[PDB]
Coordinates of all heavy atoms in Angstrom, one line a residue:
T1 N 30.5 -91.2 -25.8 CA 29.9 -90.0 -25.1 C 29.8 -90.2 -23.6 O 30.0 -89.3 -22.8 CB 28.6 -89.6 -25.7 OG1 27.6 -90.5 -25.5 CG2 28.8 -89.2 -27.2
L2 N 29.5 -91.5 -23.2 CA 29.3 -91.7 -21.8 C 30.6 -91.5 -21.0 O 30.7 -91.1 -19.9 CB 28.7 -93.1 -21.6 CG 28.6 -93.6 -20.2 CD1 27.6 -92.8 -19.6 CD2 28.0 -95.1 -20.2
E3 N 31.7 -91.8 -21.7 CA 33.0 -91.8 -21.2 C 33.4 -90.4 -20.8 O 34.3 -90.2 -20.0 CB 34.0 -92.5 -22.1 CG 35.4 -92.5 -21.6 CD 35.7 -93.8 -20.9 OE1 34.8 -94.4 -20.3 OE2 37.0 -94.1 -20.9
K4 N 32.7 -89.3 -21.3 CA 33.0 -87.9 -21.0 C 32.4 -87.5 -19.6 O 32.7 -86.4 -19.2 CB 32.5 -87.0 -22.1 CG 33.3 -87.1 -23.4 CD 34.7 -86.5 -23.2 CE 35.5 -86.7 -24.5 NZ 36.7 -85.8 -24.5
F5 N 31.5 -88.4 -19.1 CA 30.9 -88.0 -17.8 C 31.4 -88.9 -16.7 O 31.0 -90.1 -16.6 CB 29.4 -88.3 -17.9 CG 28.6 -87.3 -18.8 CD1 28.4 -87.6 -20.1 CD2 28.0 -86.2 -18.2 CE1 27.7 -86.8 -21.0 CE2 27.3 -85.3 -19.1 CZ 27.0 -85.7 -20.4
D6 N 32.4 -88.4 -16.0 CA 32.8 -89.2 -14.8 C 31.7 -89.6 -13.9 O 31.7 -90.7 -13.4 CB 33.8 -88.4 -14.0 CG 35.2 -88.2 -14.6 OD1 35.5 -88.9 -15.7 OD2 36.0 -87.4 -14.0
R7 N 30.6 -88.7 -13.8 CA 29.4 -88.7 -13.0 C 28.7 -90.1 -13.5 O 27.9 -90.7 -12.7 CB 28.6 -87.5 -13.6 CG 27.6 -86.8 -12.7 CD 27.2 -85.5 -13.0 NE 25.8 -85.2 -12.4 CZ 25.1 -84.1 -12.6 NH1 25.6 -83.2 -13.5 NH2 23.9 -83.9 -12.0
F8 N 28.8 -90.5 -14.8 CA 27.8 -91.6 -15.2 C 28.6 -92.8 -15.7 O 27.9 -93.8 -16.2 CB 27.0 -91.0 -16.4 CG 26.1 -89.8 -15.9 CD1 26.0 -88.7 -16.7 CD2 25.4 -89.9 -14.7 CE1 25.2 -87.6 -16.3 CE2 24.6 -88.8 -14.3 CZ 24.5 -87.6 -15.1
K9 N 29.9 -92.8 -15.8 CA 30.5 -93.8 -16.4 C 30.5 -95.2 -15.7 O 30.6 -96.3 -16.3 CB 31.8 -93.3 -17.0 CG 32.8 -93.1 -16.0 CD 34.1 -92.6 -16.7 CE 35.0 -91.8 -15.8 NZ 36.0 -92.7 -15.1
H10 N 29.9 -95.2 -14.5 CA 29.5 -96.4 -13.8 C 28.3 -97.1 -14.3 O 28.0 -98.3 -13.9 CB 29.4 -96.3 -12.2 CG 28.2 -95.5 -11.9 ND1 28.2 -94.1 -11.9 CD2 26.9 -95.9 -11.5 CE1 27.0 -93.7 -11.6 NE2 26.2 -94.7 -11.2
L11 N 27.5 -96.5 -15.1 CA 26.3 -97.0 -15.6 C 26.6 -98.0 -16.8 O 27.2 -97.6 -17.7 CB 25.4 -95.9 -16.0 CG 25.0 -94.9 -14.9 CD1 24.3 -93.6 -15.4 CD2 24.1 -95.6 -13.9
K12 N 26.3 -99.3 -16.6 CA 26.7 -100.2 -17.6 C 25.5 -100.8 -18.4 O 25.7 -101.6 -19.3 CB 27.4 -101.4 -16.9 CG 28.6 -101.1 -16.0 CD 29.7 -100.3 -16.7 CE 30.8 -100.2 -15.6 NZ 31.6 -99.1 -15.9
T13 N 24.2 -100.6 -17.9 CA 23.0 -101.1 -18.6 C 22.0 -100.0 -18.7 O 22.0 -99.0 -18.0 CB 22.3 -102.3 -17.8 OG1 21.7 -101.7 -16.7 CG2 23.3 -103.4 -17.5
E14 N 21.1 -100.2 -19.7 CA 20.1 -99.2 -19.9 C 19.2 -99.2 -18.6 O 18.7 -98.1 -18.2 CB 19.2 -99.6 -21.0 CG 18.0 -98.7 -21.3 CD 17.4 -98.8 -22.7 OE1 17.9 -99.7 -23.4 OE2 16.5 -98.0 -23.0
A15 N 18.9 -100.3 -18.0 CA 18.1 -100.2 -16.7 C 18.8 -99.4 -15.7 O 18.1 -98.6 -15.0 CB 17.9 -101.7 -16.2
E16 N 20.2 -99.5 -15.5 CA 20.9 -98.7 -14.5 C 20.7 -97.3 -15.0 O 20.5 -96.4 -14.1 CB 22.3 -99.1 -14.5 CG 22.5 -100.5 -13.8 CD 24.0 -101.0 -13.9 OE1 24.9 -100.3 -14.5 OE2 24.2 -102.1 -13.4
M17 N 20.8 -96.9 -16.2 CA 20.7 -95.5 -16.7 C 19.3 -95.0 -16.3 O 19.1 -93.9 -15.8 CB 20.9 -95.4 -18.2 CG 22.4 -95.7 -18.5 SD 22.5 -95.7 -20.3 CE 24.2 -96.4 -20.5
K18 N 18.3 -95.8 -16.6 CA 16.9 -95.3 -16.3 C 16.6 -95.2 -14.8 O 15.8 -94.4 -14.5 CB 15.9 -96.4 -16.9 CG 15.8 -96.3 -18.5 CD 14.9 -97.3 -19.1 CE 14.7 -96.9 -20.6 NZ 13.5 -96.0 -20.9
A19 N 17.4 -95.9 -14.0 CA 17.2 -95.8 -12.6 C 18.0 -94.7 -11.9 O 17.8 -94.4 -10.7 CB 17.6 -97.1 -12.0
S20 N 18.9 -94.0 -12.6 CA 19.7 -93.0 -12.1 C 19.0 -91.6 -11.9 O 18.7 -91.0 -12.9 CB 21.0 -92.8 -12.9 OG 21.7 -91.7 -12.4
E21 N 18.8 -91.2 -10.7 CA 18.2 -89.9 -10.5 C 19.2 -88.8 -10.9 O 18.7 -87.8 -11.5 CB 17.7 -89.8 -9.0 CG 16.9 -88.5 -8.8 CD 15.5 -88.6 -9.5 OE1 15.1 -89.7 -10.1 OE2 14.9 -87.6 -9.5
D22 N 20.4 -89.0 -10.7 CA 21.4 -88.0 -11.1 C 21.4 -87.8 -12.6 O 21.5 -86.7 -13.2 CB 22.8 -88.4 -10.6 CG 23.7 -87.2 -10.6 OD1 23.2 -86.1 -10.1 OD2 24.8 -87.4 -11.0
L23 N 21.2 -88.9 -13.4 CA 21.2 -88.8 -14.9 C 19.9 -88.0 -15.3 O 19.9 -87.1 -16.1 CB 21.2 -90.2 -15.5 CG 21.2 -90.2 -17.0 CD1 22.4 -89.4 -17.4 CD2 21.5 -91.5 -17.6
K24 N 18.8 -88.3 -14.6 CA 17.5 -87.6 -14.9 C 17.7 -86.1 -14.5 O 17.2 -85.2 -15.3 CB 16.5 -88.2 -14.0 CG 15.1 -87.7 -14.3 CD 14.0 -88.5 -13.5 CE 12.6 -88.0 -13.8 NZ 11.7 -89.0 -13.1
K25 N 18.4 -85.7 -13.4 CA 18.7 -84.3 -13.2 C 19.5 -83.7 -14.3 O 19.2 -82.5 -14.7 CB 19.4 -84.3 -11.8 CG 18.4 -84.4 -10.7 CD 19.1 -84.4 -9.4 CE 20.1 -83.2 -9.3 NZ 20.9 -83.2 -8.0
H26 N 20.5 -84.4 -14.7 CA 21.3 -83.7 -15.8 C 20.6 -83.6 -17.1 O 20.8 -82.6 -17.9 CB 22.6 -84.5 -16.0 CG 23.6 -83.7 -16.6 ND1 24.0 -82.5 -16.0 CD2 24.2 -83.7 -17.8 CE1 24.9 -81.9 -16.8 NE2 25.0 -82.6 -17.9
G27 N 19.7 -84.6 -17.4 CA 18.8 -84.3 -18.5 C 18.0 -83.1 -18.5 O 17.8 -82.4 -19.5
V28 N 17.4 -82.8 -17.3 CA 16.7 -81.5 -17.2 C 17.6 -80.3 -17.4 O 17.3 -79.4 -18.0 CB 16.1 -81.5 -15.8 CG1 15.5 -80.1 -15.5 CG2 14.9 -82.5 -15.7
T29 N 18.8 -80.4 -16.8 CA 19.8 -79.3 -17.0 C 20.1 -79.1 -18.5 O 20.1 -77.9 -19.0 CB 21.1 -79.7 -16.4 OG1 20.8 -79.6 -14.9 CG2 22.2 -78.5 -16.6
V30 N 20.3 -80.1 -19.3 CA 20.6 -80.0 -20.7 C 19.4 -79.4 -21.4 O 19.6 -78.5 -22.2 CB 21.0 -81.4 -21.2 CG1 21.1 -81.3 -22.8 CG2 22.4 -81.8 -20.6
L31 N 18.2 -80.0 -21.2 CA 17.1 -79.5 -22.0 C 16.6 -78.2 -21.6 O 16.1 -77.4 -22.4 CB 15.9 -80.5 -21.9 CG 16.2 -81.9 -22.5 CD1 14.9 -82.7 -22.6 CD2 16.8 -81.8 -23.9
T32 N 16.8 -77.8 -20.3 CA 16.5 -76.4 -19.9 C 17.4 -75.4 -20.7 O 16.9 -74.4 -21.2 CB 16.6 -76.3 -18.4 OG1 15.7 -77.2 -17.8 CG2 16.3 -74.8 -18.0
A33 N 18.7 -75.7 -20.8 CA 19.6 -74.8 -21.5 C 19.2 -74.8 -23.0 O 19.2 -73.7 -23.6 CB 21.0 -75.2 -21.3
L34 N 19.0 -76.0 -23.6 CA 18.6 -75.9 -25.0 C 17.3 -75.2 -25.3 O 17.2 -74.5 -26.2 CB 18.5 -77.4 -25.5 CG 18.2 -77.5 -27.0 CD1 19.2 -76.9 -27.9 CD2 18.1 -79.0 -27.3
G35 N 16.3 -75.4 -24.4 CA 15.0 -74.7 -24.6 C 15.2 -73.2 -24.6 O 14.7 -72.4 -25.4
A36 N 16.0 -72.7 -23.7 CA 16.3 -71.2 -23.6 C 17.0 -70.7 -24.9 O 16.7 -69.7 -25.3 CB 17.2 -70.9 -22.4
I37 N 17.9 -71.6 -25.5 CA 18.5 -71.2 -26.7 C 17.5 -71.2 -27.9 O 17.4 -70.2 -28.6 CB 19.7 -72.2 -27.0 CG1 20.8 -71.9 -26.1 CG2 20.1 -72.2 -28.5 CD1 21.8 -73.2 -26.0
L38 N 16.7 -72.2 -27.9 CA 15.7 -72.3 -29.0 C 14.7 -71.1 -29.0 O 14.4 -70.6 -30.1 CB 15.0 -73.7 -29.0 CG 15.8 -74.9 -29.3 CD1 15.0 -76.2 -29.1 CD2 16.4 -74.8 -30.7
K39 N 14.3 -70.8 -27.8 CA 13.3 -69.7 -27.7 C 13.9 -68.3 -28.0 O 13.1 -67.4 -28.3 CB 12.8 -69.7 -26.3 CG 11.8 -70.9 -26.0 CD 11.5 -71.0 -24.6 CE 10.9 -72.3 -24.3 NZ 10.5 -72.5 -22.9
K40 N 15.2 -68.2 -28.2 CA 15.9 -67.0 -28.7 C 15.9 -66.9 -30.2 O 16.3 -65.9 -30.8 CB 17.3 -66.8 -28.3 CG 17.4 -66.6 -26.8 CD 16.8 -65.4 -26.4 CE 17.2 -65.0 -25.0 NZ 17.0 -63.6 -24.8
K41 N 15.5 -68.0 -30.9 CA 15.3 -68.0 -32.3 C 16.5 -67.5 -33.0 O 16.4 -66.6 -34.0 CB 14.0 -67.2 -32.8 CG 12.8 -67.9 -32.2 CD 11.6 -67.0 -32.2 CE 11.1 -66.7 -33.6 NZ 10.0 -65.7 -33.7
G42 N 17.7 -68.0 -32.7 CA 18.9 -67.6 -33.4 C 19.6 -66.4 -32.7 O 20.8 -66.3 -32.9
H43 N 18.9 -65.6 -31.9 CA 19.6 -64.4 -31.2 C 20.1 -64.9 -29.9 O 19.7 -64.5 -28.8 CB 18.6 -63.3 -31.0 CG 18.1 -62.7 -32.3 ND1 16.9 -63.0 -32.8 CD2 18.8 -61.9 -33.2 CE1 16.8 -62.3 -34.0 NE2 17.9 -61.7 -34.2
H44 N 20.9 -66.0 -30.0 CA 21.3 -66.7 -28.8 C 22.8 -66.6 -28.4 O 23.3 -67.4 -27.6 CB 21.0 -68.2 -29.0 CG 21.6 -68.8 -30.3 ND1 20.9 -69.7 -31.1 CD2 22.8 -68.5 -30.9 CE1 21.7 -70.0 -32.1 NE2 22.8 -69.3 -32.0
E45 N 23.4 -65.5 -28.8 CA 24.8 -65.4 -28.4 C 25.1 -65.4 -27.0 O 26.1 -66.1 -26.5 CB 25.3 -64.0 -29.0 CG 26.7 -63.4 -28.4 CD 27.9 -64.1 -28.9 OE1 27.7 -64.9 -29.9 OE2 29.0 -63.9 -28.4
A46 N 24.3 -64.7 -26.2 CA 24.5 -64.7 -24.7 C 24.4 -66.1 -24.1 O 25.1 -66.4 -23.1 CB 23.5 -63.7 -24.1
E47 N 23.5 -66.9 -24.6 CA 23.4 -68.2 -24.0 C 24.5 -69.1 -24.5 O 25.0 -70.0 -23.8 CB 22.1 -68.7 -24.5 CG 20.8 -68.1 -24.0 CD 20.6 -66.6 -24.3 OE1 20.9 -66.2 -25.4 OE2 20.0 -65.9 -23.5
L48 N 24.9 -69.0 -25.7 CA 25.9 -69.9 -26.2 C 27.3 -69.8 -25.7 O 28.0 -70.7 -25.6 CB 26.1 -69.9 -27.7 CG 25.3 -70.9 -28.5 CD1 24.1 -71.5 -27.7 CD2 25.2 -70.8 -30.0

């Protein structure tokens, strides 16, 4: 999976991952999009 992110494929250890602010930003992007889908309770066509 890491290999799909050109942005992150330089990260070779868990400590490097935890230290990456760009990784933490993308995590918020992912979970914000998933939260908006979950809060539609299945009526999520527009978001998907």
